[PDB]
Ligand binder design. Structure first.
Ligand SMILES: CC(C)(Sc1ccncc1-c1ccc(C#N)c2ccccc12)C(=O)O
Length: 515
């Protein structure tokens, strides 16, 4: 007797599945919050060079003449390109000549200015303090935020790999609960460190544990149900992320100091760890290893939950042993990576599939972590990304049946791509339309992820199917690391980052219909 018959006589759609779906989807919201917090915990508020005559009340008490604050600001700080005071320069000697309008204040050499040797002054209109304010990553080290985000994503990658191996060797629920605890502890410790490298290291560990819990949640959610309702489980696991975006919006609107926000986001994972003990472990994996009694215990439990004790009373050890004998082998795992490239018919089916996976990690994270520039109100913008995602996410599954197979993937990438290209041409005065085009861009990229998981399976044969979706996972992560690093090239122009981020999916999507 095979395992599906046992899962059939125990219950696949019973209430137990609903309870487990709720209890495992709820933490996905907070995982999304931890992943997206870098948009609010490290914002860049306005800044100007520290001034002796403006800031120090000692010199403020000795000022000859009661001039307006705008006058003093014009005297101390040269103007900038946006008619605002310059952000990294200061007049070395108070220039009183600038007051007279008879002299056109335009011939100022950089030799008359000096770098800010007395710190900076930030505005506290909407943010009380962020790490940009705390450690002054401005005007010389402004390239240290993409470094932090790249470190976070590298942490996700390494943690995913290590936790995958460990969960294959140890179990699902064990690695799940220990990853919960690791997220909680590492977040708590990261919310109090005094210097920057320690903050980076503990963000690394947080991301590793988050990758672990995400993968194990996916596996456990898919495994304990029948093959009929799998895609519904994947759909719920996808909706978790959008609801997490909305939660991030609300929570960030709540708290404005990066330490308290970080603690509030990292707290409830201990509560999740505290109740992760009552969930029954996966029985199929236990059958694979060979601990039959444990599997029978878990099966009797889950059957007793669904009010199906009578039929499960017949379960015995020998039928589980025969099921183990019917379990397939994974010895061939070594040569699957080779034959994916060796056979010509399978070479091209991969080189296109990865560019579908790589284009998502590169375009999404390169923008969704820079919501400061693509609009004005961050709290409302962060919320709309999650709200719009659901209509597109539900609509895309409808479009599958009507427009066909090949035309689904190609369509769900050109549309998010062309909106980013149109961002530069739209005049800077029309701020409303510039923001609305950004939301539809980042929002529609949610359904782009849902489709590639579905189309990954039907392309490759079932023998090597697990391997192909595996490599698609690495190219998606390995591309995310190169996401934020692109924003370094903004020094050449403010439009160039918006050019690279949108051309990649269009060149990916239009090339995906060739399958
Ligand atoms: C899962 C990752 C590593 S990305 C990621 C990293 C950290 N935390 C959440 C996500 C994430 C994954 C799939 C999503 C989808 N759809 C999604 C949607 C919104 C927000 C986050 C994600 C990937 O590249 O596969």
């Amino acid at each position: 007797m095979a395992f599906p018959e046992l899962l059939d006589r125990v219950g696949g759609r019973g209430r137990f599945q609903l309870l487990q779906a709720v209890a495992l989807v709820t933490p996905i919201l907070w995982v999304t919050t931890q992943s997206m917090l870098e948009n609010f915990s490290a914002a860049v508020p306005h800044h100007r060079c520290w001034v002796p005559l403006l800031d120090n009340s000692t010199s403020q008490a000795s000022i000859p003449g009661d001039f307006g604050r705008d006058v003093l600001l014009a005297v101390s700080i040269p103007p900038g390109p946006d008619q605002r005071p310059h952000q990294c320069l200061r007049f070395r000697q108070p220039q009183w000549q600038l007051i007279e309008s008879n002299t056109t204040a335009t011939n100022w050499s950089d030799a008359d200015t000096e770098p800010c040797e007395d710190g900076w002054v930030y505005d506290h209109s909407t943010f009380r303090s962020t790490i940009v304010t705390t450690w002054d990553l401005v005007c010389d080290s402004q390239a240290l935020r993409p470094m932090a985000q790249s470190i976070f994503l590298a942490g996700i990658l390494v943690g995913a790999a290590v936790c995958g191996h460990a969960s294959d060797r140890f179990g699902r629920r064990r690695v799940l609960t220990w990853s919960y605890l690791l997220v909680s502890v590492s977040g708590t410790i990261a919310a109090l460190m005094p210097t920057f490298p320690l903050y980076c290291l503990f963000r690394f560990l947080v991301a590793s544990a988050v990758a672990g819990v995400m993968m194990n949640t996916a596996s456990l959610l898919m495994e304990w149900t029948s093959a009929q309702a799998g895609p519904l489980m994947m759909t719920l696991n996808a909706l978790g992320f959008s609801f997490g975006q909305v939660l991030t919006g609300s929570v960030a609107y709540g708290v404005r100091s990066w330490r308290m926000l970080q603690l509030a986001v990292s707290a409830p994972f201990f509560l999740f760890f505290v109740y992760s003990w009552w969930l029954p472990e996966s029985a199929r994996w236990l059958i694979t290893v060979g601990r039959l009694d444990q599997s029978l215990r878990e099966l009797q439990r889950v059957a007793a939950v669904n009010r199906r004790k009578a039929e499960a009373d017949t379960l015995t050890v020998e039928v589980l042993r025969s099921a183990m004998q019917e379990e397939p082998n994974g010895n061939q795992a070594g040569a699957r990576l080779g034959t994916l490239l060796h056979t010509p018919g399978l070479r091209l089916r991969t080189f296109i599939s990865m560019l579908c996976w790589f284009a998502f990690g590169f375009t999404f994270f390169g923008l969704a972590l820079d919501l400061q520039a693509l609009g004005s109100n961050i709290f409302l913008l962060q919320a709309l990304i999650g709200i719009v995602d659901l209509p597109v996410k539900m609509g895309s599954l409808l479009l599958l049946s009507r427009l066909g197979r090949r035309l689904c993937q190609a369509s769900s990438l050109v549309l998010p791509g062309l909106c980013i290209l149109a961002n530069i041409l739209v005049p800077r005065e029309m701020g409303i339309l510039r923001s609305s085009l950004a939301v539809l861009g980042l929002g529609s990229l949610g359904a782009a992820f849902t489709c590639v998981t579905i189309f990954s399976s039907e392309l490759f044969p079932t023998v090597i199917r697990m391997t192909a979706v595996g490599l698609g996972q690495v190219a998606a992560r390995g591309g995310a690391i190169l996401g934020p690093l692109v924003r370094l090239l903004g020094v050449y122009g403010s439009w160039l980052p918006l050019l690279v981020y949108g051309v990649v999916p269009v060149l990916s999507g239009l090339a995906a219909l060739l399958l």
